[PDB]
Structure formats: C-alpha cells, structure tokens
C-alpha cells in the first residue's frame, strides 16, 4: 500500500493532530483540490458542512483495493498517512463531481 489509515472511522474536527495538513470540505468542494505533501505526511480532511462527504480512491491508487473512506458528518475529520511518492486522485462517493488529488513527493 501507499498509505496507512490512523483511524478507520471519522473523528471530531477538534481532535485533528499537530502537524496535520488540513483540507477543508466547504461549499460542496475540496477547498484545496490539489495538495502537495511529502512521504510520511498525514493529510486530514474536515467536513465543514451539513451534507456528508468522504474521500474515495479507486482500486490501484492507494493500494490494490479501492479506499472508500467513511462518511464524515458536519465537523468531522478523517486522515490518511501517505507512505510512498505518487499522484493520488480521489472523489466524494455521494458526489462524484467533487474531485481532488494529493501529490506526494
Ligand atoms: Cu461530497
């Protein structure tokens, strides 16, 4: 795999980690749709709105299987720690028009 998952379920925005690289989900978009990080960094998405959102990477992107993240309710968060360089496209499962990528260097 190309990422590890600190928590399989979402958690409160209040508990996002120090050194957290945060992508807000607001106005029905990933507010940083193209994010550049380093190997070993943890990215945390935080849903700011009432509509649920997730992050979903199809099979072959973060690993052999698709990574369909859990649905984040308002003011919840979800993290991925990227362990290998690459370009990792994702979308929101319920809203496939909502797309982003993480580029890991
Ligand atoms: Cu969404």
Closest CA to 82 of 99, 67, 98, 97: 67
Neighbours of 55 (CB within 10 A): 25
Euclidean distance between CA atoms 34 and 27, whole angstroms: 16
- Terminal Cα-to-Cα distance of the chain (whole angstroms): 16
| Three-state SS sequence of the chain | CCEECCCCCCEEHHHCCCCCEEEEEECCEECCCEEEECCCCEEEEEECCCCCECCEECCCCCCCCCEECCCECCCEEEEEEECCCEEEEEEECCEEEEEEEEEEC
Q: Is the dihedral of CA 66, 48, 6, 11 positive or negative?
A: negative
Resolution in A: 0.9
Distance 27 CA to ligand 1 centre (A): 10
Residue 45's Cβ-count burial label (10 Å; 0-12, 13-18, 19+) is buried
What is the dotted CATH code of the domain comprising 1-105? Answer: 2.60.40.420
For ligand 1, the distance from its centroid to the CA atom of residue 91, given in whole angstroms, is 8
User: 44 C-alpha vs ligand 1 centroid, how far in Å?
Assistant: 15
Going by their DSSP bridges, the two strands 3-4 and 21-26 should be labelled as unpaired
Rounded distance from Cα 60 to ligand 1 centre (Å): 21
CA of 99 to the centre of ligand 1 (A): 9
């Amino acid at each position: 795999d190309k990422a590890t998952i600190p928590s399989e379920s979402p958690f409160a925005a209040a508990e996002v980690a120090d050194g957290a690289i945060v992508v807000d989900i607001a106005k029905m978009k990933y507010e940083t749709p193209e994010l550049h990080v380093k190997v070993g960094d943890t990215v945390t998405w935080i849903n700011r709105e009432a509509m649920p959102h997730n992050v979903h990477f199809v099979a072959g992107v973060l690993g052999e299987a698709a990574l369909k993240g859990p649905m984040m309710k308002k003011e919840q968060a979800y993290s991925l720690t990227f362990t290998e360089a690459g370009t990792y496209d994702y979308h929101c499962t319920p809203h496939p028009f909502q797309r982003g990528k993480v580029v890991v260097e």
